[PDB]
Amino acid sequence: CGMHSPNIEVVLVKIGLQSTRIGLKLIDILLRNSDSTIDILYQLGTTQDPGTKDRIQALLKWVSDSARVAAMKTVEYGLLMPSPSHLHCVAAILWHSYELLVEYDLPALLDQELFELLFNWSMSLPCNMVLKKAVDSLLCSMCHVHPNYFSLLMGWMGITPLALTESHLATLASSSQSPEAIKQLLDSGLPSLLVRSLASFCFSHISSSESINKMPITADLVAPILRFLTEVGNSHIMKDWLGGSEVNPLWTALLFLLCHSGSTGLTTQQRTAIENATVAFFLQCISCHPNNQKLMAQVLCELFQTSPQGNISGFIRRLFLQLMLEDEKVTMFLQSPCPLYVIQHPMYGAGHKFRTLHLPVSTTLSDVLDRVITVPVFHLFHKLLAGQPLPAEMTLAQLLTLLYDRKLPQGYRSIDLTVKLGSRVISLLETCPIQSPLQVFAGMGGLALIAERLIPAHSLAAFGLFLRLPGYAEVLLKERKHAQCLLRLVLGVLPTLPFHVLRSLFSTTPLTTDDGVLLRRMALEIGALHLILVCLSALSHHSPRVPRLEEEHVTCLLQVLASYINPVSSQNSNALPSVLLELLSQSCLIPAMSSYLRNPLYRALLELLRAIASCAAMVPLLLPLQTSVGTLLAKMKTCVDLVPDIQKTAEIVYAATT
Numbered sequence: 318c319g320m321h322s323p324n325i326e327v328v329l330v331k332i333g334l335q336s337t338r339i340g341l342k343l344i345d346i347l348l349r350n351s352d353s354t355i356d357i358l359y360q361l362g363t364t365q366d367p368g369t370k371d372r373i374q375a376l377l378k379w380v381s382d383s384a385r386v387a388a389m390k391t392v393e394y395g396l397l398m399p400s401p402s403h404l405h406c407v408a409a410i411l412w413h414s415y416e417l418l419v420e421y422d423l424p425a426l427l428d429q430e431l432f433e434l435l436f437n438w439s440m441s442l443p444c445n446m447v448l449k450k451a452v453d454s455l456l457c458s459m460c461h462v463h464p465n466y467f468s469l470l471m472g473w474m475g476i477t478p479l480a481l482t483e484s485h486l487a488t489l490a491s492s493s494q495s496p497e498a499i500k501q502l503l504d505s506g507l508p509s510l511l512v513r514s515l516a517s518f519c520f521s522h523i524s525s526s527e528s529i530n531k532m533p534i535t536a537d538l539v540a541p542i543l544r545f546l547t548e549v550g551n552s553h554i555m556k557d558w559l560g561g562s563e564v565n566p567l568w569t570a571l572l573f574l575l576c577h578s579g580s581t582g583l584t585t586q587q588r589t590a591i592e593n594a595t596v597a598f599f600l601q602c603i604s605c606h607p608n609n610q611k612l613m614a615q616v617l618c619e620l621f622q623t624s625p626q627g628n629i630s631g632f633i634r635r636l637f638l639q640l641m642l643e644d645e646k647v648t649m650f651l652q653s654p655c656p657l658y659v660i661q662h663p664m665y666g667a668g669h670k671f672r673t674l675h676l677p678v679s680t681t682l683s684d685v686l687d688r689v690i691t692v693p694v695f696h697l698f699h700k701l702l703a704g705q706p707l708p709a710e711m712t713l714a715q716l717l718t719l720l721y722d723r724k725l726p727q728g729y730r731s732i733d734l735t736v737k738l739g740s741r742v743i744s745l746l747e748t749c750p751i752q753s754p755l756q757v758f759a760g761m762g763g764l765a766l767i768a769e770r771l772i773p774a775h776s777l778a779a780f781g782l783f784l785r786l787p788g789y790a791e792v793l794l795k796e797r798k799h800a801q802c803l804l805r806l807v808l809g810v811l812p813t814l815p816f817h818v819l820r821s822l823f824s825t826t827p828l829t830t831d832d833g834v835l836l837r838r839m840a841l842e843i844g845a846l847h848l849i850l851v852c853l854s855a856l857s858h859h860s861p862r863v864p865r866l867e868e869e870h871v872t873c874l875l876q877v878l879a880s881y882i883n884p885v886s887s888q889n890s891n892a893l894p895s896v897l898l899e900l901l902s903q904s905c906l907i908p909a910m911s912s913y914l915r916n917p918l919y920r921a922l923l924e925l926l927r928a929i930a931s932c933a934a935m936v937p938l939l940l941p942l943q944t945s946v947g948t949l950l951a952k953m954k955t956c957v958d959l960v961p962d963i964q965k966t967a968e969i970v971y972a973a974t975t
Contacts, residue, residue, distance in 0.1 A: 318353075326353055330360045337368035344375050348403065349395035352669075355406045359668045362410030363417070370421040373414065376407050377426055380455065384434040387441060401451030405660050408451075408458040409667035415462045424462050432459065432466050436473075439488045449484070450660050453491035458663055461495035471505050478532055483541045490548045494662055499552065506530075508549070511542055512567065519570030526578040536583075540590035543598060550601045553728030559602065560612055568616065571595065576630050592632060599640050603754050605647055605717060606728040613640075614758040621766040629770055637767060638808050641755035642801060644677040647713060649685060653736035657689050664731065673731075678717065678751060679797065683709040686736075694741045697734045701725065706739070714750035753797075759790035773812055773870070775855075779848055780807060780815035786836060786843075792822045812866075816873045823880035824887035833884060834892060841896060846881075849874060850904040859912060861905040862942070872918040875925050882935060883928035890933045901938055911941075914949065920959075923966035926950070930973035939974065947974035 318325055333340040340361065347354055361372055379396075386396040414423050439452050460467040470492075474481060493502045502508060510530055518534040534542070549555055558564065574583075575591060603609040620633070650665060651657060651672035658669055665673040672689055686695055686709070697707035701723050707716070713732075721727060758764075765785045780803065783789060793800055796814075803814055826833040840846060853874050854860060856867050880887040913922070926946075929935050939946050947970045954967045 322353060326356055326360070329357055330364070333357075333361050334364060334366055334368065337371050340368055340372055341375050344372060344379075348379050348399075349392055352402075354400075355402055356668050358403065358406045359410060362407070363413045365417070365419065369414075369419070370426075373410065373423075373426060376410065377431070380404065380407060381431060381434060384431075384438045384452075387438045388434060398448075399451075401447045401660070404448075404451035405454050406667055408454045409663055411455075411462065412458045412663035413666075415458075427459055427463050427466070429466060429469070432456075432463075432470065435459075436470070436488075440482075440484055444484055444487050447660065449487070450491065453488050454660060454663070456488065457492040457495050457498060460492055461497050461663075464497045464501055467492070467498050467501050471501070471507065476505060476507050481538070483538070486538070486541050486545055490545045493549065494551075499549070502549075511545070512564070515539060515542065516566050516570060519567070519574050522578065522581050523570060523573050525581050526574075536587055540587065540594050543591065543594035547594065547597045547601045550598065551730045553606070553726055556602060556606050556609055556728045560608065572620070575632055592635075595632075596636070596639060599636065603640075604645065604728075604730060605751075607752060607757070608727060610752065610754045610757040613754060614761065614763065617758060618761060618763050618766060621763065621770060624766075624770050627770065641753075641758055642804055644679045644797075644801075645751065645753055646675060646677050647717070648731035649674040649676050649713075650731050650733035651689065651736060652733065655736065655738060657736070676713075678713040678753075681710050681712045682707060690743045692741050692743060693738045696737050696739045698737060699734060707734070708746055711746055712750065714753075715746070715748045717751050718748055719745070756790075756794045759794060762787050762790070764790045772806065773866075775852055776812040776815050776870075777803075777807055779845075779852070782843065782845060782848065783815055783819055786822075786839060788826065788832065788836065789818065789822060792825060793818045795821075813869065813873050816877050820873075820877050820880040820887060823877070823884055825884075827884045828889060828892040837881070837893065837897075840881075841894075841900075846897070846900060849877065850906075853909065854905045857905070857909045857912070859905050859909045861903055862908060864903070868918065872921050875918070876921050879921065879925035879928045882925070883931045886924060886928045886931065889931075893932060893934055895934070898934060898938065901935075907938070907941070914953065920962065923963065927966050927969050930969055936973060939970075945974045947971035 329343070333343055344358075344361065347357060358376075362369070362376065380399070383396045383399045386393065411423070435452055435456055439449060439456065442449060460470065471477070474485065489502075489507075493499050510532065513530065514532045514534050517531050518539070550559065559567075571591075575588070575595070580588075599613065603613055617636075649672075651674075652666070653670060653672075656669050657672045661673050665671060674685065674689075676685060682697060686697075698705075699707075699720070701720065716732070720729075720732065765787065768781055768785045771781065784793070799810070799814055803811060822836070826836055828834060828837075850861070853871065856870050856874070876887075929939065947967075950967045950970050954963055957963065
């Protein structure tokens with residue numbers, strides 16, 4: 318069938334929707350006696366005809382028979398075990414029948430006994446296979462159709478002591494994803510009692526470790542119920558509720574539990590479980606939510622500010638290497654009448670005509686559309702935009718900023734686009750991108766805080782010292798991918814960038830403002846000039862005056878020095894202290910300059926010369942300790958004789974020397 322399968326499925330759909338009896342018979346022989354069967358069931362269930370009610374009745378009768386067969390324990394083989402993909406397809410069919418305007422009374426088909434049967438089926442088997450996920454997606458769709466069914470489900474597990482296994486909470490978290498279920502769950506006291514219980518357990522454990530409506534939570538359920546928190550954090554009002562002072566004890570308690578209380582006893586497997594659940598929670602919280610981004614930035618700055626005086630624990634280290642060093646991932650939803658070529662939420666549809674991806678923000682629309690004369694061309698539209706398409710090279714950060722400026726609520730985890738076919742004959746791109754958690758954390762200088770607590774190797778060692786300066790990260794974040802690659806090389810073009818960011822920061826911070834002089838005096842205090850001078854001494858094989866990659870390194874270091882002397886070149890006399898003058902009189906600048914002269918890089922050296930001649934307080938170092946530099950430079954300029962620049966720089970040096 319692999320060459321003509323669309324034809325077969327289409328003719329099967331037409332024969333099925335010809336009459337009711339034939340469709341019911343073929344449903345029976347396709348379910349009792351693959352992706353294609355999922356598409357067949359979808360097109361049978363969601364297409365509207367007078368025979369739709371009997372078809373969904375047959376589907377419900379089949380799933381009830383399978384639940385019965387699983388409940389007491391030839392034609393019954395399909396009832397001994399059902400395909401979980403078929404159950405997810407039935408859930409999608411019921412969901413799209415509830416969503417679309419149907420002629421029949423859909424909740425009349427749903428029965429409470431079906432709720433009891435599928436609930437007993439759910440606890441009859443463990444959580445490893447996907448059959449539990451399928452029957453739980455069916456439970457979620459049916460309870461979305463019937464809110465009173467979920468309302469009675471709360472009354473079963475003692476909710477208006479308690480003991481819930483991991484499968485119980487798994488079924489509840491799976492079946493709470495629908496808006497009516499999550500509305501009833503917020504209306505129910507189960508989330509409030511669980512967060513109060515886990516906060517009390519954390520506080521009790523902290524009090525026991527530091528001394529060396531409430532309900533006791535054991536050491537096993539806490540990782541699954543933290544995963545419950547991760548799964549419910551998709552709602553934006555959930556993210557706002559987690560941002561209040563009522564919840565903040567959860568954060569502080571979990572951190573004090575997982576840092577101070579080392580190996581009540583925490584075993585390594587459960588510690589890893591809580592560790593991974595907290596990673597998932599942190600990844601879930603700040604997803605497309607700038608408020609959560611600044612919240613985590615403030616929280617991590619407060620933890621790094623009160624770091625003990627020196628070793629960083631494994632959790633905080635891996636959280637730094639994980640949370641803000643991977644690109645932000647958003648949920649992509651694609652609706653299209655044309656074919657576009659795992660269990661997901663029923664908002665995301667089914668079949669190949671509904672697409673759902675979990676993709677990083679940094680990519681553009683051309684890459685996600687490639688992976689999924691009048692010429693038909695794909696065009697992208699939004700439900701909040703009327704009459705204009707979307708550019709192919711526009712990244713998702715720009716789209717997220719446009720939607721957040723277009724009344725889309727903050728924290729909306731899944732963005733939806735419709736693909737249409739237009740004709741081609743053979744402002745939007747200029748918007749600001751998303752801020753991202755990494756740059757938000759770097760906005761208040763958290764990089765210096767984490768540096769204080771922490772290919773040639775000397776450049777990578779000097780990068781950590783260089784990023785301690787304020788304003789370094791703001792100019793560092795201009796190229797995201799290469800900065801992330803450099804941080805990945807730090808944890809354990811590439812050597813040029815730690816100095817190129819310093820040169821650009823020197824050039825963007827002039828001497829006419831307070832930021833430039835503060836940066837220069839902090840560089841004088843922390844000792845960056847000594848490090849770059851001994852690096853130049855080691856690279857040039859020359860010693861200070863005691864009282865192919867190397868060429869690029871020397872050129873870049875000379876460029877850094879030139880941008881340090883004159884920021885405008887890339888009260889000026891008293892803008893720089895004489896400490897730099899007495900420091901440069903000791904180093905190896907003069908002998909290396911004399912060695913290199915007597916032999917881009919020449920252009921950088923001439924820029925350094927006009928920079929060192931531009932500052933009057935930096936002038937008297939040019940006198941050698943007896944040929945002047947101006948006459949020498951004129952001699953080798955006549956020897957060389959680009960040319961107008963060389964002549965202008967030589968004339969400037971000659972004027973400075975005279």
